[PDB]
């Protein structure tokens, strides 16, 4: 495996209509990480969004709780959803950067969001990061910064595509 990443990993390989698929975004090495900007796209016929609790997405919602960026080094935390296109977007990031720094932890590796899928359709189907012009130095749509709130522009592979019922591909 490469030696940094992102990746959104699946619980499931298959899934049946009215199966919860669990998609958990993975870092691996990420140089003082800090937080990220992300742009996922999902097919809304096959995939619904909904909360730990069950409820569906709204264009504010953020996805749920990882293993990492759940310290209160003042999290940041926007969404901007499109729930009719399948598209995730948020930013989570701390704003404390000196205590951050100061800790002299930093939070590599982990698992940074886990989006809860509702399957609606038994078909293959997949999902990914995906460029937008509204967040212009996305690579392969993902933005990661370091604990000095600067961009990592290279070194990290986007790992792709998380695929459902993959067995089941028409292509
Ligand atoms: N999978
Ligand atoms: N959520
Ligand atoms: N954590
Ligand atoms: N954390
Ligand atoms: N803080
Ligand atoms: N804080
Ligand atoms: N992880
Ligand atoms: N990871």
Redesign the pocket.
Same mark, same amino acid.
């Given at each position: 495996a490469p030696t940094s990443s992102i990746e959104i990993v699946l619980d499931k390989t298959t899934a049946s209509v009215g199966e919860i698929v669990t998609a958990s975004i993975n870092i691996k090495n990420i140089t003082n990480f800090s937080g990220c900007q992300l742009n996922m796209k999902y097919d809304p016929a096959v995939l619904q969004p909904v909360t730990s609790s069950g409820v569906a997405y709204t264009k504010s919602t953020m996805p749920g709780a990882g293993t990492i960026l759940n310290s &209160?080094?003042?999290l940041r935390q926007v969404a901007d959803n499109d729930l009719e296109k399948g598209i995730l977007n948020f930013s989570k990031a701390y704003?404390?950067l000196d &205590?951050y720094r100061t800790a002299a932890a930093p939070e590599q590796t982990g698992t940074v969001a886990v989006v809860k899928f509702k399957v609606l359709k038994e078909e293959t189907s997949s999902i990914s990061f995906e460029d937008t012009t509204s967040v212009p130095n996305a690579i392969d749509g993902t933005v990661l910064f370091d604990w000095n709130g600067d961009r990592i522009q290279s070194g990290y592979s986007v790992i792709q595509p998380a695929v459902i019922n993959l067995d089941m591909i028409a292509a």
């Open positions: &209160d080094f003042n704003v404390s &205590d």
